[PDB]
Write an enzyme that holds these catalytic residues in place. Structure first.
Site, PDB file in Angstrom:
ATOM      1  N   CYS A   1       0.806  -1.216   0.000  1.00  0.00           N
ATOM      2  CA  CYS A   1       0.000   0.000   0.000  1.00  0.00           C
ATOM      3  C   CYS A   1       0.843   1.270   0.000  1.00  0.00           C
ATOM      4  CB  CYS A   1      -0.953   0.013   1.200  1.00  0.00           C
ATOM      5  SG  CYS A   1      -0.147  -0.194   2.810  1.00  0.00           S
ATOM      6  N   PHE A   2       2.162   1.157   0.166  1.00  0.00           N
ATOM      7  CA  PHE A   2       3.065   2.299   0.248  1.00  0.00           C
ATOM      8  C   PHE A   2       4.117   2.258  -0.859  1.00  0.00           C
ATOM      9  CE2 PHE A   2       5.876   5.038   3.172  1.00  0.00           C
ATOM     10  CZ  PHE A   2       5.192   6.191   2.823  1.00  0.00           C
ATOM     11  N   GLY A   3       3.779   1.673  -2.006  1.00  0.00           N
ATOM     12  CA  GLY A   3       4.739   1.591  -3.094  1.00  0.00           C
ATOM     13  C   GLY A   3       5.955   0.778  -2.693  1.00  0.00           C
TER      14      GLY A   3
ATOM     15  N   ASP B   1      -6.518   2.126  10.241  1.00  0.00           N
ATOM     16  CA  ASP B   1      -6.255   0.939   9.421  1.00  0.00           C
ATOM     17  C   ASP B   1      -5.470  -0.107  10.217  1.00  0.00           C
ATOM     18  OD1 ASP B   1      -6.417  -0.743   7.263  1.00  0.00           O
ATOM     19  OD2 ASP B   1      -4.883   0.299   6.075  1.00  0.00           O
TER      20      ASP B   1
HETATM   21  C1  LIG Z   1      -1.382  -1.248   3.838  1.00  0.00           C
HETATM   22  C2  LIG Z   1      -0.756  -2.650   3.824  1.00  0.00           C
HETATM   23  C3  LIG Z   1       0.750  -2.557   3.555  1.00  0.00           C
HETATM   24  O1  LIG Z   1       1.161  -2.633   2.398  1.00  0.00           O
HETATM   25  N1  LIG Z   1       1.517  -2.435   4.670  1.00  0.00           N
HETATM   26  C4  LIG Z   1       2.864  -2.316   4.631  1.00  0.00           C
HETATM   27  C5  LIG Z   1       3.532  -1.552   3.668  1.00  0.00           C
HETATM   28  C6  LIG Z   1       4.928  -1.439   3.688  1.00  0.00           C
HETATM   29  C7  LIG Z   1       5.693  -2.073   4.674  1.00  0.00           C
HETATM   30  C8  LIG Z   1       7.112  -1.947   4.698  1.00  0.00           C
HETATM   31  N2  LIG Z   1       7.610  -1.086   5.835  1.00  0.00           N
HETATM   32  C9  LIG Z   1       7.262   0.216   5.915  1.00  0.00           C
HETATM   33  O2  LIG Z   1       6.552   0.709   5.044  1.00  0.00           O
HETATM   34  N3  LIG Z   1       7.656   1.007   6.927  1.00  0.00           N
HETATM   35  C10 LIG Z   1       7.368   2.325   6.929  1.00  0.00           C
HETATM   36  C11 LIG Z   1       6.203   2.918   7.428  1.00  0.00           C
HETATM   37  C12 LIG Z   1       6.060   4.319   7.364  1.00  0.00           C
HETATM   38  O3  LIG Z   1       4.942   4.945   7.829  1.00  0.00           O
HETATM   39  C13 LIG Z   1       4.680   6.132   7.052  1.00  0.00           C
HETATM   40  C14 LIG Z   1       7.066   5.110   6.819  1.00  0.00           C
HETATM   41  C15 LIG Z   1       8.222   4.522   6.331  1.00  0.00           C
HETATM   42  O4  LIG Z   1       9.214   5.302   5.796  1.00  0.00           O
HETATM   43  C16 LIG Z   1      10.458   4.589   5.706  1.00  0.00           C
HETATM   44  C17 LIG Z   1       8.360   3.141   6.394  1.00  0.00           C
HETATM   45  C18 LIG Z   1       8.575   0.514   7.973  1.00  0.00           C
HETATM   46  C19 LIG Z   1       8.991  -0.796   7.760  1.00  0.00           C
HETATM   47  C20 LIG Z   1       9.914  -1.341   8.644  1.00  0.00           C
HETATM   48  N4  LIG Z   1      10.339  -2.653   8.454  1.00  0.00           N
HETATM   49  C21 LIG Z   1       9.849  -3.386   7.432  1.00  0.00           C
HETATM   50  N5  LIG Z   1      10.329  -4.643   7.343  1.00  0.00           N
HETATM   51  C22 LIG Z   1      10.002  -5.557   6.412  1.00  0.00           C
HETATM   52  C23 LIG Z   1      10.812  -6.688   6.377  1.00  0.00           C
HETATM   53  C24 LIG Z   1      10.574  -7.716   5.473  1.00  0.00           C
HETATM   54  C25 LIG Z   1       9.508  -7.636   4.584  1.00  0.00           C
HETATM   55  N6  LIG Z   1       9.305  -8.648   3.712  1.00  0.00           N
HETATM   56  C26 LIG Z   1       8.327  -8.547   2.599  1.00  0.00           C
HETATM   57  C27 LIG Z   1       8.852  -9.368   1.425  1.00  0.00           C
HETATM   58  N7  LIG Z   1       9.002 -10.802   1.755  1.00  0.00           N
HETATM   59  C28 LIG Z   1       7.804 -11.553   1.350  1.00  0.00           C
HETATM   60  C29 LIG Z   1       9.264 -11.037   3.195  1.00  0.00           C
HETATM   61  C30 LIG Z   1      10.086  -9.909   3.816  1.00  0.00           C
HETATM   62  C31 LIG Z   1       8.683  -6.507   4.610  1.00  0.00           C
HETATM   63  C32 LIG Z   1       8.924  -5.479   5.524  1.00  0.00           C
HETATM   64  N8  LIG Z   1       8.944  -2.845   6.591  1.00  0.00           N
HETATM   65  C33 LIG Z   1       8.481  -1.589   6.732  1.00  0.00           C
HETATM   66  C34 LIG Z   1       5.020  -2.824   5.641  1.00  0.00           C
HETATM   67  C35 LIG Z   1       3.625  -2.934   5.622  1.00  0.00           C
END
Ligand SMILES: *CCC(=O)Nc1ccc(CN2C(=O)N(c3cc(OC)cc(OC)c3)Cc3cnc(Nc4ccc(N5CCN(C)CC5)cc4)nc32)cc1
Length: 261
Positions: free
Chosen positions: A20-22, A129
């Site tokens: 959902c966040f590109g 959400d």
């Molecule tokens: C709405 C449903 C959805 O898509 N949720 C979602 C999107 C993106 C992420 C990844 N993020 C992330 O976006 N973070 C974040 C949030 C935020 O709020 C505004 C701002 C940001 O600016 C940087 C970032 C934080 C974050 C922290 N850690 C991770 N870790 C992560 C590790 C592994 C994976 N995997 C996906 C791929 N494969 C299948 C397994 C490993 C994903 C994320 N991610 C985020 C999360 C939820």
């Protein structure tokens, strides 16, 4: 300007996926700190509009909320947060770890999520959400609430919010109750076999999800409190946190592990 870092201090290493966040990257900050890195396609937000939306991430601070680390607020804009090693709670529950999680692990994760939301509650914010896809997991089963409000879900949404836009911390409590079914089914879609249209009126007609198999009725009753029709009657996140923290002493002291929970 305190949150601003040099562009050369970020190394973008691994794409995490197009949710959902590109596109979001795992990377390193100052060569020493693993971080999550997000950049915005130039044009979609002015530098002034972004720093007005960065206020939320700069003031809210809690160990169960995804922590902002740094910002590059001129286009192309970059956002830097703490890194959660296990991805989303949804992916965590569905993947290879699912088969090993039992009720003690799943309840502790829920208590952590409730703790983050209790912080949101104490701050009179709303996280419109809440669901397993928006919880991130780290080492040692650490779970933190992420907030994609900057990115700008019927089955997770309280009726009064989906129908009348009455989004409150009480509708968040409704979503947490749905989140508890994701936990206890290890990530299954709620209301299995029902379309969104089917979910809307069925819930308005009083339907609630039944007790998931091997889930104790006491935990299902907690879900039903989260799903009361009148939002004012739903418990607080402060209450939810304490109930989940104390669950295996005060509420299921005779719990015995089963085949899945
Ligand atoms: C709405 C449903 C959805 O898509 N949720 C979602 C999107 C993106 C992420 C990844 N993020 C992330 O976006 N973070 C974040 C949030 C935020 O709020 C505004 C701002 C940001 O600016 C940087 C970032 C934080 C974050 C922290 N850690 C991770 N870790 C992560 C590790 C592994 C994976 N995997 C996906 C791929 N494969 C299948 C397994 C490993 C994903 C994320 N991610 C985020 C999360 C939820």
């Amino acid at each position: 300007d305190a949150w601003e870092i040099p562009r050369e201090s970020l190394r973008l290493e691994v794409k995490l996926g197009q949710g959902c966040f590109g596109e979001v990257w795992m990377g390193t900050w100052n060569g020493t700190t693993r971080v999550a890195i997000k950049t915005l396609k130039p044009g979609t937000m002015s530098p002034e509009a972004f720093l007005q939306e960065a206020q939320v991430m700069k003031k809210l601070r809690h160990e169960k909320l995804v922590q902002l680390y740094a910002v590059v607020s001129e286009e192309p804009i970059y956002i830097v947060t703490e890194y959660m090693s296990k991805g989303s709670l949804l992916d965590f529950l569905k993947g290879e770890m699912g088969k090993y999680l039992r009720l003690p692990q799943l309840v502790d994760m829920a208590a952590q999520i409730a703790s983050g939301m209790a912080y949101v509650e104490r701050m009179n914010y709303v996280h419109r959400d809440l669901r397993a896809a928006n919880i991130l997991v780290g080492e040692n089963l650490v779970c933190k609430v992420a907030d994609f409000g900057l990115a700008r879900p019927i089955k997770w949404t309280a009726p009064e919010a989906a129908l009348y836009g009455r989004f409150t911390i009480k509708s968040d409590v409704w979503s947490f109750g749905i989140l508890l079914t994701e936990l206890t089914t290890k990530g299954r879609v709620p209301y299995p076999g029902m379309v969104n249209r089917e979910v809307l009126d069925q819930v308005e007609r009083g339907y609630r999800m039944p007790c998931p198999p091997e889930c104790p009725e006491s935990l299902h009753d907690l879900m039903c409190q989260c799903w009361r029709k009148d939002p004012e009657e739903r418990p607080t996140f402060e209450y939810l946190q304490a109930f989940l923290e104390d669950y295996f002493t005060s509420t299921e002291p005779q719990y015995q592990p089963g085949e899945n929970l």
